[PDB]
């Protein structure tokens with residue numbers, strides 16, 4: 001897992017707090033390469049073997065659409081995860097300045113996220129948290145999924161020995177959990193709306209009320225507010241990723257052949273366009289020269 | 290309702306009932322009680338105790354108070370002289386159709402109440418159904434039912450933004466992926482257990498049973514010896530054992546079923562069983 005009991009300041013120069021555990025911009029002391037350092041506060045009763053396993057899940061990822069992992073540092077009951085630095089931050093950080101993404105910019109992001117998701121799911125990993133805040137953009141306009149599952153089955157293993165009085169739905173939860181990797185496909189459909197509208201659907205509704213409505217029978221999956229503005233391909237992409245039944249929701253590899261993400265002309269240049277907007281968001285210079 | 294003062298001060302310890310539950314006597318009133326001894330978050334502990342304390346119904350064991358001493362938690366509960374139905378049938382053998390119909394009615398009254406309080410028992414079985422000396426039926430928690438409910442309520446307060454969650458993820462975040470109707474199915478299995486001395490598939494490996502239950506085309510269990518039981522009993526088993534929880538009847542709905550609504554269902558049927566237990 002490459003977890004070093006050393007102080008991270010020995011190898012890296014902390015530069016600036018990027019966000020919030022806490023993420024910092026850092027420079028490699030020998031090469032001068034920019035990295036990101038995610039600091040996670042560890043409690044004393046935390047199990048070491050469980051931390052090594054979680055870290056190794058990140059370490060064993062070798063895909064272009066998942067942030068690269070360089071190493072980890074355990075010092076002062078604080079874990080420092082060293083990863084690929086993505087200059088433009090998250091898509092949430094970006095759209096909060098630029099406004100709504102265009103249909104082609106979203107199509108390219110969805111394609112890149114789906115490539116990341118197809119790889120994770122083929123390794124039996126579930127991101128579990130796909131949203132604008134967790135999709136990073138580097139200076140080249142490239143898309144990376146941030147780290148997942150760190151400091152997040154054993155309880156469910158206890159009941160497994162006595163299933164004889166269990167209802168079929170309880171037995172299904174006990175054996176495979178109440179969800180699988182297809183939860184990420186639904187989260188990506190919500191993310192595509194988020195990128196188009198600046199908010200996920202029902203964002204103005206109380207957290208608890210949304211949870212209740214989502215579980216309530218007759219629950220209708222979200223849809224894009226405007227119609228004509230978006231192609232039939234984009235509306236269908238949202239409709240199929242937001243399939244209510246996970247038994248009917250398509251896999252990431254199935255989605256990769258969808259018209260919205262398989263169309264020609266989708267490249268990081270679409271994101272470099274968005275980045276240009278980010279660099280100069282306000283109006284041009286006034287008469288005061 | 291938890292105290293730091295050692296329980297031996299209020300109660301005289303008696304014989305171990307099952308392990309860890311103990312029979313005990315109140316030092317001032319002489320009243321018999323049962324003490325559940327359990328060997329860490331104080332927020333989750335208070336949540337568990339409150340679930341037990343707020344259970345005030347004639348078909349649910351009464352809570353008296355709790356004691357935290359030597360890192361051990363002693364939960365003082367109402368005493369039921371005949372122990373669990375499991376303890377009983379391992380001595381008497383099979384219950385009759387009328388004794389089962391009476392137990393099912395009493396359990397359903399206990400469940401209708403728990404379900405009305407947004408509580409789920411989650412471990413309905415012969416082992417968790419107590420019988421007192423007067424032939425009355427009380428639902429109990431030998432295991433970790435209140436712990437599960439408390440742990441779920443704890444996870445709810447710490448549940449992050451829900452807006453990107455798939456509906457199935459929302460269901461586990463909100464209620465562990467199922468609802469109160471699981472108790473209805475467990476009651477269906479318990480009625481077979483009281484009739485045959487074991488739930489269906491008891492002889493089959495638990496991993497194999499889990500795979501069998503989660504497979505497509507899984508047939509709900511049925512009573513083995515069909516001619517021994519009435520059409521009403523066969524039907525009660527059929528409807529409580531509805532595979533889909535969308536079609537499974539509620540505890541209030543089940544209380545209007547012929548098997549449990551019929552006259553001549555009273556504690557006298559269990560008194561006959563208890564005398565058989567003493568014979």
Ligand SMILES: CCN(CC)CCNC(=O)c1c(C)[nH]c(/C=C2\C(=O)Nc3ccc(F)cc32)c1C
Nearest residue numbers: 018019036067083084085086087089093146147
């Ligand atoms: C809070 C205000 N911020 C201004 C500094 C908003 C803009 N955000 C920023 O600058 C920013 C930048 C430039 N990078 C990141 C984050 C990460 C990065 O590079 N690799 C990672 C790997 C994993 C991970 F989980 C996060 C990151 C942010 C938040």
Ligand SMILES: CCN(CC)CCNC(=O)c1c(C)[nH]c(/C=C2\C(=O)Nc3ccc(F)cc32)c1C
Nearest residue numbers: 306307323366367368369370372376429430431
């Ligand atoms: C296996 C046969 N054994 C013979 C010695 C045990 C028979 N069983 C017995 O004696 C017995 C008696 C008389 N009460 C209980 C249990 C409880 C009780 O009264 N209130 C509760 C409240 C909560 C709870 F979680 C358990 C009990 C048993 C096991």
